[PDB]
């Protein structure tokens, strides 16, 4: 994993947020519950 | 498995689980935070 502090989330240029740092070691745990995926293209027809 | 349109590979495909997947994420680094005085009232939190 990689950590960034200067953030432009929602990509809106002109305005960026700098997240301050968090003290000590960080830990968190989450239920993965869904996904967002993209397919491919025509390529070979029906092979895979 | 829901997608507005699957024939359209460009349409993102959204998935819903019946079972949650656990994930354990850490920043395994005990972090110092310096607070820097740029004020009056303005203070910047750096990393020690």
């Amino acid at each position, epitope marked *: 994993c990689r950590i960034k502090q200067i953030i432009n989330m929602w*990509q809106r240029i002109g305005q960026a947020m700098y997240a301050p740092p968090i003290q000590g070691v960080i830990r968190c745990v989450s239920n993965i519950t869904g996904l967002i995926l*993209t397919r491919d*293209g*025509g*390529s*070979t*027809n029906s092979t895979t | 498995i829901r997608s507005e349109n699957i*024939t359209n590979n*460009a349409k993102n495909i959204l998935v819903q689980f019946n079972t949650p997947v656990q994930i354990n994420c850490t920043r395994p680094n005990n972090n110092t935070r310096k607070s820097i005085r740029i004020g009056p009232g303005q203070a910047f939190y750096a990393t020690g």
Partner: antibody, heavy 126, light 108 residues
Framework: EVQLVESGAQVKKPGASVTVSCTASGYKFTGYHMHWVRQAPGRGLEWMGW????????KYPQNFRGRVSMTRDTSMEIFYMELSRLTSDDTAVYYCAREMFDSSADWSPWRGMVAWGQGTLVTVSS | SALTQPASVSGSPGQSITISCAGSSRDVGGFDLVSWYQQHPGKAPKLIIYEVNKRPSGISSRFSASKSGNTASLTISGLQEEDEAHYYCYSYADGVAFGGGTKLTVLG
């Protein structure tokens, strides 16, 4: 007016890789898909992929996958495209082109390309 | 190319001509994404038709297109010297399919 303005034509050795710049203007840059298309001399058109300028999503064909690197500089409004491992077969005039409507619309990005780069001639010979 | 076009078509100036684009049910038949492009020699291509029968703004009423089953057809009426160019058909087939391109000339 919009305007797709591409880079200058380039004369290159085989085996190498080459990028093409294509700078957009005259519309909401980040909202519109950009296709890249080569056209080998006298031949038909080879669709090489596309980018969505919002966060940079892409999709290439199976033929062109691996060799193609397609990007954009939202800050500067420049699209970049790089075919790599150039062979004599990779000699073509390379275009960038924009689909009819913005990304918010339905069925974008598969409608039809309107604005057209001037073509960039890339020549692969030994 | 996955879409099959005539190699060359000859038409007398002023007449009416038609260009065919045939594909599987995967592209032409099952979709209305047929679109056509004109390209003058040594120039960038230019969109002409889309959604099987749609003219972008700036396309003369002489130009029209349609699809009949798995075979779409492009038609030009009252031809004129400006139309001597290369013409390629397009349809979406999960990726991007393309017609081989047809050359337009003068007949007689």
């Amino acid at each position: 007016e919009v305007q797709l303005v591409e880079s200058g034509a380039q004369v290159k050795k085989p085996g190498a890789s080459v990028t093409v710049s294509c700078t957009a203007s005259g519309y909401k840059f980040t909202g519109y898909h950009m296709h890249w298309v080569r056209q080998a001399p006298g031949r038909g058109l080879e669709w090489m992929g596309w980018i969505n300028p919002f966060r940079g999503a892409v999709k290439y064909p199976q033929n062109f996958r691996g060799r193609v690197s397609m990007t954009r500089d939202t800050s500067m409004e420049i699209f970049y495209m790089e075919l790599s491992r150039l062979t004599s077969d990779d000699t073509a005039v390379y275009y960038c082109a924009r689909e009819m409507f913005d990304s918010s619309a339905d069925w974008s990005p598969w409608r039809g390309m309107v604005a057209w780069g001037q073509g960039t001639l890339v020549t692969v010979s030994s | 190319s996955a879409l099959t076009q005539p190699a060359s078509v000859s038409g007398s100036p002023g007449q009416s001509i038609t260009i065919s684009c045939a594909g599987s049910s995967r592209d032409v038949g099952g979709f209305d994404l047929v679109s056509w492009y004109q390209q003058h020699p040594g120039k960038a291509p230019k969109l002409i038709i889309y959604e099987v029968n749609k003219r972008p703004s700036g396309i003369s009423s002489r130009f029209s297109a349609s699809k009949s089953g798995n075979t779409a057809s492009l038609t030009i009426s009252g031809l004129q010297e400006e139309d001597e160019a290369h013409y390629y058909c397009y349809s979406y087939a999960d990726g991007v399919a393309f017609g081989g391109g047809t050359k337009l000339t003068v007949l007689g």
